[PDB]
Coordinates of C-alpha atoms (C1' of nucleotides) and ligand atoms in Angstrom, one line a residue:
Chain A
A6 CA -17.9 -8.3 -17.1
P7 CA -20.0 -11.8 -16.9
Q8 CA -23.7 -11.9 -17.0
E9 CA -24.6 -12.7 -12.8
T10 CA -26.9 -15.2 -14.1
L11 CA -23.7 -16.9 -15.4
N12 CA -23.0 -18.7 -11.7
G13 CA -24.7 -15.9 -9.3
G14 CA -26.2 -18.7 -7.7
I15 CA -23.0 -19.6 -6.4
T16 CA -21.5 -16.2 -5.6
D17 CA -24.5 -15.1 -3.7
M18 CA -23.9 -18.2 -1.5
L19 CA -20.7 -17.7 -1.2
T20 CA -21.6 -14.7 -0.4
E21 CA -23.6 -15.3 2.4
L22 CA -21.7 -18.0 3.6
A23 CA -19.0 -15.0 4.0
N24 CA -21.0 -12.3 6.6
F25 CA -22.4 -15.4 8.6
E26 CA -18.3 -15.8 9.2
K27 CA -17.4 -12.1 9.8
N28 CA -20.2 -11.3 11.2
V29 CA -21.9 -14.0 13.5
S30 CA -18.6 -16.3 13.4
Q31 CA -16.4 -14.1 14.0
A32 CA -14.2 -15.6 11.7
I33 CA -12.9 -12.3 9.7
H34 CA -11.0 -14.8 7.7
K35 CA -12.7 -17.1 6.5
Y36 CA -14.7 -14.3 5.3
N37 CA -12.1 -12.8 3.6
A38 CA -11.8 -16.5 1.9
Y39 CA -15.1 -16.8 1.1
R40 CA -15.0 -13.5 -0.6
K41 CA -12.5 -14.3 -2.5
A42 CA -12.8 -17.1 -3.8
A43 CA -17.2 -15.8 -4.7
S44 CA -14.7 -12.6 -6.5
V45 CA -12.8 -15.5 -8.8
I46 CA -15.7 -17.1 -9.2
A47 CA -18.2 -13.9 -10.7
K48 CA -15.4 -13.0 -12.7
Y49 CA -14.8 -16.7 -14.5
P50 CA -16.9 -16.5 -17.9
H51 CA -18.6 -19.8 -18.3
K52 CA -21.8 -21.9 -16.5
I53 CA -19.8 -24.1 -14.1
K54 CA -20.5 -27.3 -14.4
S55 CA -19.1 -29.1 -11.1
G56 CA -16.8 -28.7 -8.1
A57 CA -13.7 -29.4 -9.4
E58 CA -14.1 -27.2 -11.7
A59 CA -14.2 -24.5 -9.4
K60 CA -11.5 -25.3 -7.9
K61 CA -9.3 -25.1 -10.6
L62 CA -9.6 -21.6 -10.2
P63 CA -7.1 -19.7 -7.4
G64 CA -8.8 -19.0 -3.8
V65 CA -11.3 -22.4 -4.5
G66 CA -10.7 -24.8 -2.6
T67 CA -11.7 -28.5 -1.4
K68 CA -14.7 -27.2 1.3
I69 CA -15.9 -24.5 -1.8
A70 CA -15.4 -27.4 -4.4
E71 CA -17.4 -29.4 -2.1
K72 CA -20.4 -26.8 -1.4
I73 CA -20.4 -26.0 -4.9
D74 CA -21.6 -30.2 -6.4
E75 CA -24.2 -29.6 -3.3
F76 CA -25.1 -26.9 -4.6
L77 CA -25.0 -27.2 -8.4
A78 CA -27.0 -31.2 -7.5
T79 CA -29.9 -29.5 -5.5
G80 CA -30.1 -25.7 -6.1
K81 CA -29.7 -24.7 -1.7
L82 CA -26.4 -25.6 0.2
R83 CA -27.9 -27.3 4.1
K84 CA -26.0 -25.2 6.4
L85 CA -26.7 -21.6 4.7
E86 CA -30.7 -22.7 5.2
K87 CA -30.5 -24.1 8.6
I88 CA -28.4 -20.8 9.4
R89 CA -31.2 -18.3 7.2
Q90 CA -34.0 -19.4 9.5
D91 CA -32.1 -19.0 12.6
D92 CA -33.3 -16.5 14.5
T93 CA -29.7 -15.5 16.8
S94 CA -27.6 -15.8 14.4
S95 CA -29.8 -13.9 11.4
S96 CA -30.5 -10.5 13.9
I97 CA -26.0 -10.5 14.9
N98 CA -25.7 -11.2 10.9
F99 CA -28.6 -8.9 10.3
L100 CA -27.6 -5.7 12.9
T101 CA -24.5 -5.4 12.0
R102 CA -25.5 -4.1 8.5
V103 CA -25.7 -0.8 11.3
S104 CA -22.5 1.9 11.2
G105 CA -21.2 1.2 14.6
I106 CA -22.0 -2.5 15.2
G107 CA -19.6 -5.3 14.8
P108 CA -20.0 -8.4 16.1
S109 CA -19.5 -8.0 19.4
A110 CA -21.6 -5.1 19.8
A111 CA -24.7 -7.1 17.2
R112 CA -23.8 -10.3 19.6
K113 CA -24.4 -8.7 22.7
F114 CA -27.8 -7.1 21.6
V115 CA -29.6 -10.1 20.3
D116 CA -28.6 -11.8 24.3
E117 CA -30.1 -9.1 25.8
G118 CA -32.7 -9.4 23.2
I119 CA -32.9 -6.5 20.3
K120 CA -32.8 -7.6 17.8
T121 CA -34.8 -6.1 15.4
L122 CA -34.6 -1.3 14.8
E123 CA -37.7 -1.4 16.1
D124 CA -35.5 -3.0 18.5
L125 CA -32.3 -0.3 19.1
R126 CA -34.4 2.7 18.6
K127 CA -36.2 2.0 22.0
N128 CA -33.3 1.2 23.5
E129 CA -31.3 4.8 22.3
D130 CA -29.0 4.5 25.5
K131 CA -27.4 1.4 24.9
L132 CA -25.8 2.5 22.2
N133 CA -22.5 4.9 21.4
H134 CA -22.4 8.0 19.5
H135 CA -21.5 6.5 15.9
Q136 CA -24.4 4.0 16.8
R137 CA -27.3 6.6 17.1
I138 CA -25.9 7.8 13.6
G139 CA -25.5 4.8 11.8
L140 CA -29.5 3.7 13.2
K141 CA -30.0 7.5 12.3
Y142 CA -28.8 6.8 8.5
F143 CA -29.6 3.0 8.6
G144 CA -31.0 3.8 4.7
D145 CA -29.5 6.2 3.2
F146 CA -25.7 4.8 3.7
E147 CA -26.5 1.6 2.1
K148 CA -27.9 3.3 -1.0
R149 CA -25.1 4.1 -3.6
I150 CA -24.3 7.9 -5.3
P151 CA -24.2 8.6 -8.3
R152 CA -21.6 10.0 -10.1
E153 CA -23.5 13.3 -10.6
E154 CA -24.4 13.8 -7.6
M155 CA -20.4 13.2 -6.2
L156 CA -19.5 15.8 -9.0
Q157 CA -21.7 18.2 -6.4
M158 CA -20.2 16.8 -3.1
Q159 CA -17.2 17.4 -4.7
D160 CA -18.2 20.7 -6.4
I161 CA -19.1 22.0 -2.7
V162 CA -15.5 20.2 -1.1
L163 CA -12.5 21.7 -3.2
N164 CA -15.1 25.5 -3.2
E165 CA -15.6 25.6 0.5
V166 CA -11.4 23.7 1.7
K167 CA -10.0 27.0 -1.2
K168 CA -12.4 29.5 0.6
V169 CA -10.5 28.4 3.7
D170 CA -7.5 28.2 3.6
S171 CA -6.1 29.0 -1.1
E172 CA -3.1 27.2 -0.5
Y173 CA -5.2 23.8 0.3
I174 CA -4.7 20.9 -1.9
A175 CA -7.6 18.5 -1.7
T176 CA -8.8 15.3 -3.7
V177 CA -12.2 13.5 -4.5
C178 CA -10.3 10.1 -4.4
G179 CA -11.8 6.9 -4.3
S180 CA -13.5 4.5 -7.6
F181 CA -14.6 8.1 -8.1
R182 CA -11.5 9.6 -9.1
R183 CA -11.6 6.5 -11.0
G184 CA -13.7 7.6 -13.2
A185 CA -16.6 5.3 -11.9
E186 CA -19.7 5.9 -12.8
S187 CA -21.3 4.8 -8.6
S188 CA -19.7 5.3 -4.8
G189 CA -20.3 4.3 -1.6
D190 CA -18.5 7.7 0.2
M191 CA -16.8 10.4 -0.4
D192 CA -12.8 9.9 0.9
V193 CA -11.4 13.4 0.5
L194 CA -7.3 13.6 1.0
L195 CA -6.3 17.3 2.5
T196 CA -2.8 18.8 2.9
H197 CA -1.2 21.6 2.5
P198 CA 2.8 23.6 2.2
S199 CA 2.5 24.3 5.9
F200 CA 2.6 20.5 7.0
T201 CA 5.0 18.5 6.2
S202 CA 6.5 14.9 7.9
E203 CA 9.3 16.7 9.8
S204 CA 7.7 20.2 12.0
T205 CA 3.6 21.1 12.8
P208 CA -2.9 21.0 14.8
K209 CA -5.6 22.4 12.9
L210 CA -5.6 22.5 9.6
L211 CA -8.2 19.7 9.4
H212 CA -10.7 21.9 11.8
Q213 CA -11.2 24.7 10.4
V214 CA -12.1 22.6 7.8
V215 CA -14.9 20.7 8.5
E216 CA -16.1 23.9 10.0
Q217 CA -16.1 25.7 7.4
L218 CA -18.1 22.5 5.6
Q219 CA -20.7 22.5 9.0
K220 CA -20.4 26.4 8.8
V221 CA -22.2 26.0 4.9
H222 CA -24.2 22.9 6.4
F223 CA -22.5 20.8 4.0
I224 CA -21.1 18.0 6.5
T225 CA -24.4 17.4 9.1
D226 CA -22.9 14.9 12.0
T227 CA -19.9 14.0 12.8
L228 CA -18.8 9.9 13.4
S229 CA -14.8 10.6 14.8
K230 CA -12.6 13.3 14.9
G231 CA -9.5 13.6 15.9
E232 CA -6.6 15.2 14.5
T233 CA -5.5 14.2 11.3
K234 CA -8.7 12.4 9.7
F235 CA -12.1 12.7 10.5
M236 CA -15.4 10.3 9.9
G237 CA -18.9 11.6 9.3
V238 CA -22.0 12.6 7.1
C239 CA -22.8 14.8 4.9
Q240 CA -26.0 16.1 2.4
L241 CA -26.1 17.7 -0.7
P242 CA -28.9 20.6 -0.7
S243 CA -32.5 19.6 -2.1
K244 CA -33.5 22.3 -4.9
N245 CA -36.8 24.3 -3.0
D246 CA -39.6 22.4 -3.5
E247 CA -37.9 18.9 -4.1
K248 CA -37.1 15.5 -2.1
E249 CA -34.2 15.5 -0.2
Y250 CA -31.1 14.1 -1.7
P251 CA -29.7 10.9 1.2
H252 CA -27.2 11.5 3.9
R253 CA -23.8 10.4 2.4
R254 CA -20.4 9.0 4.4
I255 CA -17.8 11.1 3.7
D256 CA -13.7 10.8 5.5
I257 CA -11.5 14.0 5.3
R258 CA -8.3 13.1 5.7
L259 CA -5.2 15.2 6.1
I260 CA -2.1 14.3 4.8
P261 CA 1.7 15.2 5.3
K262 CA 2.2 17.2 1.8
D263 CA 5.9 14.9 1.5
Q264 CA 3.8 11.9 2.3
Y265 CA 0.6 13.8 -0.1
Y266 CA 0.8 12.0 -3.2
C267 CA 1.5 8.7 -2.3
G268 CA -1.9 8.9 -0.6
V269 CA -3.6 9.6 -3.4
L270 CA -2.1 6.5 -5.2
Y271 CA -3.3 4.2 -2.7
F272 CA -6.6 5.9 -2.3
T273 CA -7.2 5.6 -5.0
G274 CA -6.7 2.1 -6.0
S275 CA -8.1 0.3 -7.3
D276 CA -6.9 -2.3 -4.2
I277 CA -6.1 -5.3 -7.6
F278 CA -4.4 -2.0 -8.9
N279 CA -2.6 -1.3 -5.6
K280 CA -1.3 -5.0 -5.0
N281 CA 0.3 -5.2 -8.4
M282 CA 2.4 -2.1 -8.1
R283 CA 3.5 -2.5 -4.8
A284 CA 4.9 -5.9 -6.6
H285 CA 6.5 -4.2 -9.6
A286 CA 8.1 -2.1 -6.7
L287 CA 9.9 -4.8 -5.1
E288 CA 11.1 -6.8 -7.7
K289 CA 12.5 -3.1 -8.8
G290 CA 13.9 -2.5 -5.8
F291 CA 11.8 -0.1 -4.0
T292 CA 9.5 -0.5 -1.1
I293 CA 5.7 1.6 -1.4
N294 CA 3.1 1.7 1.2
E295 CA 0.4 4.1 2.2
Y296 CA 3.4 7.1 3.4
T297 CA 5.6 6.5 1.1
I298 CA 8.4 4.6 -1.4
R299 CA 11.6 4.1 0.2
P300 CA 15.1 1.8 -1.9
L301 CA 15.7 -1.4 -0.7
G302 CA 20.0 -2.4 -0.1
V303 CA 21.2 -5.3 -1.3
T304 CA 20.7 -7.0 1.9
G305 CA 16.5 -5.4 1.8
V306 CA 17.5 -2.8 4.0
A307 CA 15.1 0.1 3.5
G308 CA 16.3 3.7 3.0
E309 CA 15.5 7.1 3.8
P310 CA 12.4 7.5 1.8
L311 CA 12.5 9.3 -1.7
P312 CA 11.4 12.5 -2.9
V313 CA 7.2 12.1 -4.1
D314 CA 6.0 15.8 -5.6
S315 CA 2.9 13.9 -7.9
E316 CA 1.5 10.3 -8.8
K317 CA 3.8 10.4 -12.0
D318 CA 7.0 10.5 -9.2
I319 CA 6.3 7.3 -8.4
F320 CA 6.0 5.5 -10.9
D321 CA 8.6 6.7 -12.5
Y322 CA 11.4 5.7 -9.9
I323 CA 9.7 1.9 -11.0
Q324 CA 10.0 3.3 -14.5
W325 CA 6.7 2.0 -14.7
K326 CA 4.8 4.6 -17.2
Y327 CA 2.4 7.0 -15.4
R328 CA -1.7 5.8 -16.1
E329 CA -4.5 7.4 -16.2
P330 CA -6.5 6.4 -12.9
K331 CA -9.5 5.7 -15.5
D332 CA -6.8 3.3 -16.2
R333 CA -5.8 1.0 -12.7
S334 CA -8.8 -1.0 -12.3
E335 CA -6.3 -3.2 -12.7
Chain B
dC1 C1' 2.0 -29.0 9.2
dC2 C1' 0.1 -24.7 10.6
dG3 C1' 1.7 -19.5 10.4
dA4 C1' -0.7 -15.1 7.9
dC5 C1' -4.1 -13.3 6.0
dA6 C1' -2.3 -5.2 6.6
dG7 C1' -2.3 -1.1 9.4
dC8 C1' -3.4 2.4 11.6
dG9 C1' -6.7 6.6 13.8
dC10 C1' -10.5 7.4 16.6
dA11 C1' -13.7 6.0 20.4
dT12 C1' -13.9 3.6 24.0
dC13 C1' -13.6 0.1 27.3
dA14 C1' -10.6 -2.5 31.1
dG15 C1' -7.5 -2.4 34.1
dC16 C1' -4.2 -0.3 37.3
Chain C
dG1 C1' -6.5 10.3 36.2
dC2 C1' -3.0 7.9 32.8
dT3 C1' -1.7 3.4 29.6
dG4 C1' -2.7 0.2 27.2
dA5 C1' -6.2 -2.7 24.6
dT6 C1' -10.1 -3.7 22.7
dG7 C1' -13.7 -2.4 18.9
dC8 C1' -14.4 -1.1 14.5
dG9 C1' -14.9 1.3 10.2
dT10 C1' -11.4 1.0 6.0
Chain D
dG1 C1' -11.7 -21.2 3.4
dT2 C1' -7.3 -21.2 1.1
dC3 C1' -2.6 -20.9 0.4
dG4 C1' 2.1 -22.3 -0.2
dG5 C1' 7.1 -22.0 3.3
Ligands
NA401 NA1 -7.8 -23.3 -6.1
NA402 NA1 -21.4 -4.0 8.2
NA403 NA1 -21.3 -2.2 10.8
NA404 NA1 -4.7 32.9 -0.2

DNA sequence: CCGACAGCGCATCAGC
DNA sequence: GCTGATGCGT
DNA sequence: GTCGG
């Protein structure tokens, strides 16, 4: 984990470029090209001396090497300095920090003179339900969640889920499950023996309802038969500053696909890419839902029975690795 | 050169 | 009213 | 923007 002082000027520049590609130019693949470059540079354990040096890293190409040369010689990038000053571009970029405001909504708002949170506050009728919640909790949603709060949040979720029906199985996944010291949100995977891919939904609703009844879930961004996305808040101790509101997702998953889901949503994203690779060369295709054998002509067969995460590792003769070990 | 860069749930729009 | 497309988040 | 068939 090299100190940011090493190439933090370069990685900051590439991340800022990334955001403008995503939010203003609506070029998601360039956004991800810049993010990939910033990640591989963020890991490089040497102070970069030239664009040509950076070009040797996978994901750094001709144009980024060129930008790195300009940044190293001048300490800035003319194109980035210009767009930073640009009133419509900076406002569009900023507004997309509201959950529910994407590039299209942010463009439309700025087009009609709505540029700041104050302007959004003044124009509630122009916001959909998701966007009102994102505005309401703009600051809270940008805070991280310390692991101790994630533990208290997990206590409530597991308790109330079991209270609804002790046969529910709930797992808090994400980097939290891998042991991380902070989280961006809470990702809950839910199943029940009565729910399989084949037959028979109110199983999700009952859990959301009970978490609302004990005043843990405070708002709903979206809710269907298999996926809930919303907002929650820990109760504050008597006479004490209140905890920030937090994003929580709850997904209902058929029992026979549950452990593929836990594996995938535990990650990390790098670990998943490797395991999928190792699965292919072993003759298996793994997605979020299933693991399947591949015949010699590539024809995917029926999904294989999975009753634990280890079942998946066993199929591809990989030793089971702890969530804390799944960084890569 | 030029296509891939993941797939999907839900809310909402666009078209009929 | 319905069906498929789009925006969005992930 | 970068990679690679
Ligand atoms: Na490169
Ligand atoms: Na955003
Ligand atoms: Na947004
Ligand atoms: Na019971």
